[PDB]
Amino acid sequence: AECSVDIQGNDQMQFNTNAITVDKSCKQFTVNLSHPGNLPKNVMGHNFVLSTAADMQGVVTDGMASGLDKDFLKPDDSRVIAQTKLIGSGEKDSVTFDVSKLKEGEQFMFFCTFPGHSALMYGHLTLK
Ligand SMILES: [Cu+2]
Protein backbone atom coordinates (compact mmCIF):
# COMPACT_ATOMS: atom_id res chain seq x y z
CA ALA A 1 0.00 0.00 0.00
CA GLU A 2 2.42 2.70 -1.18
CA CYS A 3 0.64 3.43 -4.48
CA SER A 4 -2.79 2.00 -3.61
CA VAL A 5 -5.82 2.46 -1.45
CA ASP A 6 -8.62 0.11 -0.43
CA ILE A 7 -12.04 1.72 -0.41
CA GLN A 8 -15.40 0.33 0.73
CA GLY A 9 -18.88 1.46 -0.22
CA ASN A 10 -21.46 0.05 2.22
CA ASP A 11 -25.22 -0.35 2.83
CA GLN A 12 -25.37 3.10 4.43
CA MET A 13 -24.49 4.84 1.13
CA GLN A 14 -21.07 5.95 2.37
CA PHE A 15 -17.52 5.40 1.23
CA ASN A 16 -15.25 4.60 4.17
CA THR A 17 -13.16 7.69 3.35
CA ASN A 18 -13.64 11.20 2.02
CA ALA A 19 -10.03 11.91 1.17
CA ILE A 20 -7.48 10.03 -0.88
CA THR A 21 -3.86 11.19 -1.16
CA VAL A 22 -1.67 10.04 -4.04
CA ASP A 23 2.13 10.13 -3.65
CA LYS A 24 3.75 12.40 -6.33
CA SER A 25 6.44 9.72 -6.50
CA CYS A 26 3.93 7.09 -7.83
CA LYS A 27 4.07 5.67 -11.36
CA GLN A 28 0.51 4.28 -11.26
CA PHE A 29 -2.27 4.32 -8.64
CA THR A 30 -4.63 1.49 -7.77
CA VAL A 31 -8.03 1.82 -6.03
CA ASN A 32 -9.44 -1.45 -4.73
CA LEU A 33 -13.19 -1.20 -4.24
CA SER A 34 -15.29 -3.62 -2.24
CA HIS A 35 -18.86 -3.73 -0.97
CA PRO A 36 -19.12 -5.14 2.61
CA GLY A 37 -22.96 -4.69 2.68
CA ASN A 38 -25.85 -7.09 2.00
CA LEU A 39 -27.63 -5.14 -0.75
CA PRO A 40 -27.39 -6.06 -4.41
CA LYS A 41 -26.11 -3.89 -7.23
CA ASN A 42 -29.67 -2.46 -7.94
CA VAL A 43 -30.47 -1.38 -4.52
CA MET A 44 -27.08 -0.10 -3.39
CA GLY A 45 -24.58 -0.54 -6.27
CA HIS A 46 -21.35 1.48 -5.94
CA ASN A 47 -18.61 2.37 -8.42
CA PHE A 48 -15.47 4.49 -7.87
CA VAL A 49 -15.27 7.25 -10.37
CA LEU A 50 -12.55 9.90 -10.70
CA SER A 51 -12.77 13.20 -12.60
CA THR A 52 -11.81 16.82 -12.15
CA ALA A 53 -14.05 18.64 -9.72
CA ALA A 54 -15.64 20.66 -12.55
CA ASP A 55 -16.47 17.54 -14.53
CA MET A 56 -18.09 15.75 -11.57
CA GLN A 57 -21.65 17.12 -12.04
CA GLY A 58 -21.69 16.19 -15.75
CA VAL A 59 -20.29 12.71 -15.05
CA VAL A 60 -23.03 11.96 -12.44
CA THR A 61 -25.99 13.43 -14.51
CA ASP A 62 -25.02 11.65 -17.77
CA GLY A 63 -24.31 8.48 -15.67
CA MET A 64 -27.84 8.37 -14.26
CA ALA A 65 -29.17 8.84 -17.84
CA SER A 66 -27.02 5.95 -18.95
CA GLY A 67 -28.82 3.34 -16.85
CA LEU A 68 -27.99 0.37 -14.68
CA ASP A 69 -26.81 -1.85 -17.60
CA LYS A 70 -24.00 0.61 -18.31
CA ASP A 71 -22.96 0.81 -14.62
CA PHE A 72 -24.56 4.32 -14.46
CA LEU A 73 -21.70 5.80 -16.47
CA LYS A 74 -21.74 7.37 -19.93
CA PRO A 75 -19.79 5.00 -22.20
CA ASP A 76 -16.43 6.36 -23.43
CA ASP A 77 -16.63 9.56 -21.33
CA SER A 78 -13.34 11.39 -21.65
CA ARG A 79 -14.05 13.25 -18.40
CA VAL A 80 -13.52 10.13 -16.39
CA ILE A 81 -9.86 9.70 -15.33
CA ALA A 82 -10.47 6.39 -13.61
CA GLN A 83 -13.48 4.15 -13.04
CA THR A 84 -14.34 0.83 -11.59
CA LYS A 85 -17.35 -1.29 -12.48
CA LEU A 86 -20.54 -0.91 -10.50
CA ILE A 87 -20.56 -3.49 -7.69
CA GLY A 88 -23.05 -4.89 -5.10
CA SER A 89 -22.75 -6.78 -1.85
CA GLY A 90 -19.77 -9.23 -1.72
CA GLU A 91 -18.29 -8.06 -4.97
CA LYS A 92 -15.03 -6.24 -5.48
CA ASP A 93 -13.27 -4.45 -8.38
CA SER A 94 -9.96 -2.65 -8.76
CA VAL A 95 -8.75 0.07 -11.16
CA THR A 96 -5.17 1.21 -11.90
CA PHE A 97 -4.46 4.47 -13.76
CA ASP A 98 -1.35 6.60 -14.72
CA VAL A 99 -0.49 9.46 -12.34
CA SER A 100 0.31 11.61 -15.39
CA LYS A 101 -3.48 11.90 -15.98
CA LEU A 102 -3.50 13.87 -12.74
CA LYS A 103 -2.84 17.11 -14.63
CA GLU A 104 -0.70 19.54 -12.55
CA GLY A 105 -3.21 22.37 -12.00
CA GLU A 106 -6.41 20.42 -11.22
CA GLN A 107 -8.70 19.81 -8.28
CA PHE A 108 -9.85 16.17 -8.27
CA MET A 109 -12.95 14.47 -6.93
CA PHE A 110 -14.01 10.86 -6.51
CA PHE A 111 -17.69 9.75 -6.24
CA CYS A 112 -20.18 7.05 -6.95
CA THR A 113 -22.55 7.60 -9.83
CA PHE A 114 -25.37 5.32 -8.67
CA PRO A 115 -28.41 7.72 -8.63
CA GLY A 116 -28.46 9.87 -5.49
CA HIS A 117 -25.31 8.39 -4.02
CA SER A 118 -22.90 11.24 -4.74
CA ALA A 119 -24.75 13.45 -2.19
CA LEU A 120 -22.68 11.51 0.39
CA MET A 121 -20.36 9.36 -1.68
CA TYR A 122 -17.66 11.91 -2.79
CA GLY A 123 -14.37 13.14 -1.73
CA HIS A 124 -11.23 14.83 -2.87
CA LEU A 125 -8.19 13.17 -4.30
CA THR A 126 -4.96 15.10 -4.06
CA LEU A 127 -1.57 14.47 -5.66
CA LYS A 128 0.93 15.22 -2.83
CU1 LIG B 1 -22.92 4.14 -4.63
PDB file of C-alpha atoms and ligand atoms in Angstrom:
ATOM      1  CA  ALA A   1       0.000   0.000   0.000  1.00  0.00           C
ATOM      2  CA  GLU A   2       2.417   2.703  -1.182  1.00  0.00           C
ATOM      3  CA  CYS A   3       0.638   3.430  -4.482  1.00  0.00           C
ATOM      4  CA  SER A   4      -2.786   2.003  -3.613  1.00  0.00           C
ATOM      5  CA  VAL A   5      -5.823   2.462  -1.453  1.00  0.00           C
ATOM      6  CA  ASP A   6      -8.622   0.107  -0.425  1.00  0.00           C
ATOM      7  CA  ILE A   7     -12.044   1.719  -0.414  1.00  0.00           C
ATOM      8  CA  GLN A   8     -15.399   0.326   0.727  1.00  0.00           C
ATOM      9  CA  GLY A   9     -18.882   1.464  -0.216  1.00  0.00           C
ATOM     10  CA  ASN A  10     -21.460   0.053   2.223  1.00  0.00           C
ATOM     11  CA  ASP A  11     -25.223  -0.352   2.827  1.00  0.00           C
ATOM     12  CA  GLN A  12     -25.373   3.096   4.428  1.00  0.00           C
ATOM     13  CA  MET A  13     -24.487   4.837   1.128  1.00  0.00           C
ATOM     14  CA  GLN A  14     -21.070   5.955   2.373  1.00  0.00           C
ATOM     15  CA  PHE A  15     -17.524   5.399   1.229  1.00  0.00           C
ATOM     16  CA  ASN A  16     -15.251   4.603   4.168  1.00  0.00           C
ATOM     17  CA  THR A  17     -13.163   7.686   3.348  1.00  0.00           C
ATOM     18  CA  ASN A  18     -13.641  11.197   2.022  1.00  0.00           C
ATOM     19  CA  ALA A  19     -10.026  11.908   1.172  1.00  0.00           C
ATOM     20  CA  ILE A  20      -7.484  10.026  -0.875  1.00  0.00           C
ATOM     21  CA  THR A  21      -3.859  11.189  -1.157  1.00  0.00           C
ATOM     22  CA  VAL A  22      -1.674  10.040  -4.042  1.00  0.00           C
ATOM     23  CA  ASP A  23       2.130  10.134  -3.647  1.00  0.00           C
ATOM     24  CA  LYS A  24       3.750  12.403  -6.329  1.00  0.00           C
ATOM     25  CA  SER A  25       6.438   9.721  -6.498  1.00  0.00           C
ATOM     26  CA  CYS A  26       3.927   7.088  -7.833  1.00  0.00           C
ATOM     27  CA  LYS A  27       4.073   5.666 -11.360  1.00  0.00           C
ATOM     28  CA  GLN A  28       0.512   4.285 -11.265  1.00  0.00           C
ATOM     29  CA  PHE A  29      -2.270   4.318  -8.639  1.00  0.00           C
ATOM     30  CA  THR A  30      -4.629   1.491  -7.771  1.00  0.00           C
ATOM     31  CA  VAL A  31      -8.026   1.819  -6.031  1.00  0.00           C
ATOM     32  CA  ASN A  32      -9.435  -1.454  -4.729  1.00  0.00           C
ATOM     33  CA  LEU A  33     -13.189  -1.197  -4.238  1.00  0.00           C
ATOM     34  CA  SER A  34     -15.293  -3.617  -2.240  1.00  0.00           C
ATOM     35  CA  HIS A  35     -18.857  -3.734  -0.965  1.00  0.00           C
ATOM     36  CA  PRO A  36     -19.116  -5.143   2.607  1.00  0.00           C
ATOM     37  CA  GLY A  37     -22.957  -4.686   2.678  1.00  0.00           C
ATOM     38  CA  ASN A  38     -25.853  -7.090   2.005  1.00  0.00           C
ATOM     39  CA  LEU A  39     -27.629  -5.140  -0.753  1.00  0.00           C
ATOM     40  CA  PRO A  40     -27.395  -6.062  -4.407  1.00  0.00           C
ATOM     41  CA  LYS A  41     -26.108  -3.892  -7.227  1.00  0.00           C
ATOM     42  CA  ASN A  42     -29.675  -2.461  -7.935  1.00  0.00           C
ATOM     43  CA  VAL A  43     -30.474  -1.378  -4.518  1.00  0.00           C
ATOM     44  CA  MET A  44     -27.083  -0.096  -3.386  1.00  0.00           C
ATOM     45  CA  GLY A  45     -24.576  -0.536  -6.274  1.00  0.00           C
ATOM     46  CA  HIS A  46     -21.351   1.483  -5.941  1.00  0.00           C
ATOM     47  CA  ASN A  47     -18.609   2.374  -8.417  1.00  0.00           C
ATOM     48  CA  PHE A  48     -15.470   4.485  -7.869  1.00  0.00           C
ATOM     49  CA  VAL A  49     -15.272   7.253 -10.373  1.00  0.00           C
ATOM     50  CA  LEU A  50     -12.555   9.901 -10.697  1.00  0.00           C
ATOM     51  CA  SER A  51     -12.774  13.201 -12.600  1.00  0.00           C
ATOM     52  CA  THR A  52     -11.814  16.823 -12.151  1.00  0.00           C
ATOM     53  CA  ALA A  53     -14.048  18.635  -9.720  1.00  0.00           C
ATOM     54  CA  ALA A  54     -15.638  20.660 -12.551  1.00  0.00           C
ATOM     55  CA  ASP A  55     -16.467  17.539 -14.527  1.00  0.00           C
ATOM     56  CA  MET A  56     -18.085  15.752 -11.567  1.00  0.00           C
ATOM     57  CA  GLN A  57     -21.648  17.121 -12.036  1.00  0.00           C
ATOM     58  CA  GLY A  58     -21.691  16.185 -15.751  1.00  0.00           C
ATOM     59  CA  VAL A  59     -20.294  12.708 -15.053  1.00  0.00           C
ATOM     60  CA  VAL A  60     -23.028  11.959 -12.442  1.00  0.00           C
ATOM     61  CA  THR A  61     -25.991  13.430 -14.508  1.00  0.00           C
ATOM     62  CA  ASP A  62     -25.019  11.650 -17.770  1.00  0.00           C
ATOM     63  CA  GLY A  63     -24.305   8.484 -15.671  1.00  0.00           C
ATOM     64  CA  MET A  64     -27.836   8.367 -14.255  1.00  0.00           C
ATOM     65  CA  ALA A  65     -29.170   8.835 -17.843  1.00  0.00           C
ATOM     66  CA  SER A  66     -27.019   5.946 -18.952  1.00  0.00           C
ATOM     67  CA  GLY A  67     -28.816   3.343 -16.853  1.00  0.00           C
ATOM     68  CA  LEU A  68     -27.988   0.371 -14.683  1.00  0.00           C
ATOM     69  CA  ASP A  69     -26.805  -1.852 -17.599  1.00  0.00           C
ATOM     70  CA  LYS A  70     -24.003   0.615 -18.309  1.00  0.00           C
ATOM     71  CA  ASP A  71     -22.963   0.808 -14.616  1.00  0.00           C
ATOM     72  CA  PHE A  72     -24.563   4.315 -14.459  1.00  0.00           C
ATOM     73  CA  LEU A  73     -21.698   5.804 -16.469  1.00  0.00           C
ATOM     74  CA  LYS A  74     -21.745   7.366 -19.927  1.00  0.00           C
ATOM     75  CA  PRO A  75     -19.793   4.996 -22.198  1.00  0.00           C
ATOM     76  CA  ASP A  76     -16.428   6.364 -23.426  1.00  0.00           C
ATOM     77  CA  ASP A  77     -16.633   9.562 -21.327  1.00  0.00           C
ATOM     78  CA  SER A  78     -13.336  11.392 -21.651  1.00  0.00           C
ATOM     79  CA  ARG A  79     -14.053  13.252 -18.401  1.00  0.00           C
ATOM     80  CA  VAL A  80     -13.520  10.134 -16.385  1.00  0.00           C
ATOM     81  CA  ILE A  81      -9.861   9.695 -15.327  1.00  0.00           C
ATOM     82  CA  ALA A  82     -10.471   6.390 -13.611  1.00  0.00           C
ATOM     83  CA  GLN A  83     -13.481   4.151 -13.036  1.00  0.00           C
ATOM     84  CA  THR A  84     -14.340   0.831 -11.587  1.00  0.00           C
ATOM     85  CA  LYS A  85     -17.352  -1.291 -12.479  1.00  0.00           C
ATOM     86  CA  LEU A  86     -20.536  -0.912 -10.501  1.00  0.00           C
ATOM     87  CA  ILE A  87     -20.556  -3.494  -7.690  1.00  0.00           C
ATOM     88  CA  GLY A  88     -23.052  -4.893  -5.104  1.00  0.00           C
ATOM     89  CA  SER A  89     -22.746  -6.780  -1.851  1.00  0.00           C
ATOM     90  CA  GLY A  90     -19.769  -9.225  -1.717  1.00  0.00           C
ATOM     91  CA  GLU A  91     -18.288  -8.055  -4.970  1.00  0.00           C
ATOM     92  CA  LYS A  92     -15.026  -6.242  -5.479  1.00  0.00           C
ATOM     93  CA  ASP A  93     -13.273  -4.449  -8.382  1.00  0.00           C
ATOM     94  CA  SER A  94      -9.956  -2.649  -8.760  1.00  0.00           C
ATOM     95  CA  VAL A  95      -8.750   0.066 -11.160  1.00  0.00           C
ATOM     96  CA  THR A  96      -5.169   1.208 -11.903  1.00  0.00           C
ATOM     97  CA  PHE A  97      -4.462   4.467 -13.762  1.00  0.00           C
ATOM     98  CA  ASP A  98      -1.345   6.595 -14.717  1.00  0.00           C
ATOM     99  CA  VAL A  99      -0.489   9.457 -12.337  1.00  0.00           C
ATOM    100  CA  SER A 100       0.308  11.610 -15.391  1.00  0.00           C
ATOM    101  CA  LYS A 101      -3.484  11.902 -15.982  1.00  0.00           C
ATOM    102  CA  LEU A 102      -3.503  13.873 -12.739  1.00  0.00           C
ATOM    103  CA  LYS A 103      -2.841  17.109 -14.631  1.00  0.00           C
ATOM    104  CA  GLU A 104      -0.700  19.539 -12.553  1.00  0.00           C
ATOM    105  CA  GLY A 105      -3.211  22.374 -11.997  1.00  0.00           C
ATOM    106  CA  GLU A 106      -6.407  20.421 -11.221  1.00  0.00           C
ATOM    107  CA  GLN A 107      -8.702  19.812  -8.275  1.00  0.00           C
ATOM    108  CA  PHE A 108      -9.847  16.167  -8.266  1.00  0.00           C
ATOM    109  CA  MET A 109     -12.948  14.467  -6.927  1.00  0.00           C
ATOM    110  CA  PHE A 110     -14.012  10.857  -6.507  1.00  0.00           C
ATOM    111  CA  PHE A 111     -17.689   9.748  -6.236  1.00  0.00           C
ATOM    112  CA  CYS A 112     -20.184   7.045  -6.949  1.00  0.00           C
ATOM    113  CA  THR A 113     -22.550   7.599  -9.831  1.00  0.00           C
ATOM    114  CA  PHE A 114     -25.367   5.321  -8.665  1.00  0.00           C
ATOM    115  CA  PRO A 115     -28.411   7.718  -8.630  1.00  0.00           C
ATOM    116  CA  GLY A 116     -28.458   9.874  -5.493  1.00  0.00           C
ATOM    117  CA  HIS A 117     -25.309   8.390  -4.022  1.00  0.00           C
ATOM    118  CA  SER A 118     -22.905  11.244  -4.736  1.00  0.00           C
ATOM    119  CA  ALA A 119     -24.751  13.447  -2.195  1.00  0.00           C
ATOM    120  CA  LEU A 120     -22.681  11.514   0.390  1.00  0.00           C
ATOM    121  CA  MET A 121     -20.363   9.365  -1.685  1.00  0.00           C
ATOM    122  CA  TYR A 122     -17.657  11.907  -2.791  1.00  0.00           C
ATOM    123  CA  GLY A 123     -14.370  13.140  -1.728  1.00  0.00           C
ATOM    124  CA  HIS A 124     -11.226  14.834  -2.869  1.00  0.00           C
ATOM    125  CA  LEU A 125      -8.188  13.174  -4.296  1.00  0.00           C
ATOM    126  CA  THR A 126      -4.957  15.099  -4.062  1.00  0.00           C
ATOM    127  CA  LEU A 127      -1.570  14.472  -5.661  1.00  0.00           C
ATOM    128  CA  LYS A 128       0.929  15.219  -2.833  1.00  0.00           C
TER     129      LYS A 128
HETATM  130 CU    CU B   1     -22.919   4.135  -4.632  1.00  0.00          CU
END
